[PDB]
Amino acid sequence: LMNAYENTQASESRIRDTDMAEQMTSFTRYQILTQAATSMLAQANMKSQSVMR
Amino acid sequence: LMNAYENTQASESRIRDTDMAEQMTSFTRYQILTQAATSMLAQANMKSQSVMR
Amino acid sequence: LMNAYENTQASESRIRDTDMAEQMTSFTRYQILTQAATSMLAQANMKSQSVMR
Amino acid sequence: GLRRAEQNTEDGMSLIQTAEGYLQETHEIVQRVRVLAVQAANGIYSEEDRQQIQVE
């Protein structure tokens, strides 16, 4: 019974628990795309004022 | 009675007392996730500052 | 029979048992290697933020 | 369940070991009467002696 618990827990651990190392790689990358899109959203609004002159 | 005392004391000890070895394993993992959750809550607060531009 | 048992257990020990002194060197090798890999993973996550200027 | 299953097998080991603790007591008593018997098969005992032995 003790042997099964450790084996079973690892079986469940792989399915449910996340790997924080590979998750931080994704989390950091999505921050920059959020930052990149926000700045390009700023320039999108400023793009309109060209015709005012 | 002494044989009864030993078997009964062992019986209740296994019921009520905690296994300290796996209790430290639980203590550390629940400690680590507290910090990981604390960091993401701090990050989530700063997530809303991007819209200021 | 005592002599045969002693020889057999000595033979069995050399096949199944492990060298604690030798395995500690291997254990320490991978422990340091993990710290180096963890260190560079953090550096690689911070690597891409430079493209934001 | 496997963690729960482990505990019951531990509790079951307690109950099994408990009963055998009493069985040890009886065997000590039964073997005392057994050795008490072989002294009462001796031929130099008066009726009061084998009556006194019987009381224990």
UniProtKB/TrEMBL annotation, chain D:
Residues of the full protein shown: 58 to 113 of 282
Function: Component of the core of the flagella.
Official protein name in the record: Flagellin
Protein's cellular compartments: Periplasmic flagellum; Periplasm
Family: Belongs to the bacterial flagellin family.
Gene responsible for this protein: flaB
